[PDB]
Design a protein around this ligand. Sequence first.
Ligand SMILES: CCn1nc(C(=O)N(C)Cc2nccs2)ccc1=O
Ligand SMILES: [Cl-]
Ligand SMILES: [Cl-]
Ligand SMILES: [Cl-]
Length: 163
Amino acid sequence: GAMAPSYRVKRMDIAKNDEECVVNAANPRGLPGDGVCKAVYKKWPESFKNSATPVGTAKTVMCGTYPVIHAVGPNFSNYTESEGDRELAAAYREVAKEVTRLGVNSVAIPLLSTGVYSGGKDRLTQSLNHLFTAMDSTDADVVIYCRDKEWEKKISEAIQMRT
Ligand SMILES: CCn1nc(C(=O)N(C)Cc2nccs2)ccc1=O
Ligand SMILES: [Cl-]
Ligand SMILES: [Cl-]
Ligand SMILES: [Cl-]
């Protein structure tokens, strides 16, 4: 584990992370997809061998010795708000189990279900709060990756509020 486990946020491509493993915002079928998923596919294509897994779960596949944790958040266009909230919290709990099992000291993570799976709604607070609930009991350094300047400021403020 990390000496003083922390949360940090960076506004950059998660495929260029400086952490010991990455969480992919995956689709259930292990397809290359779009957004974070396509960048992850271009950087670690070997990690997509048998990576298909149900919504609400996470499945790790090694690219060399680098772990790619494929986490499948719900698509809010298909799920109700209630059932979608439950699957989003579950996907993060499965990421925490995988990070612990791997024994890594750090992990790069995106905000699940905030892009094309958002159902057209701003889900920054909802997704980030489920991320904290799952990762707070782990001792890995967590680095959250985003692409928007206003989202970087809001995520940074949410982390600082707790310290
Ligand atoms: C543009 C800032 N930003 N917005 C979202 C967002 O809110 N999504 C995609 C859902 C929406 N679609 C229309 C309106 S709200 C996700 C990440 C991000 O950085
Ligand atoms: Cl970048
Ligand atoms: Cl998404
Ligand atoms: Cl973003």
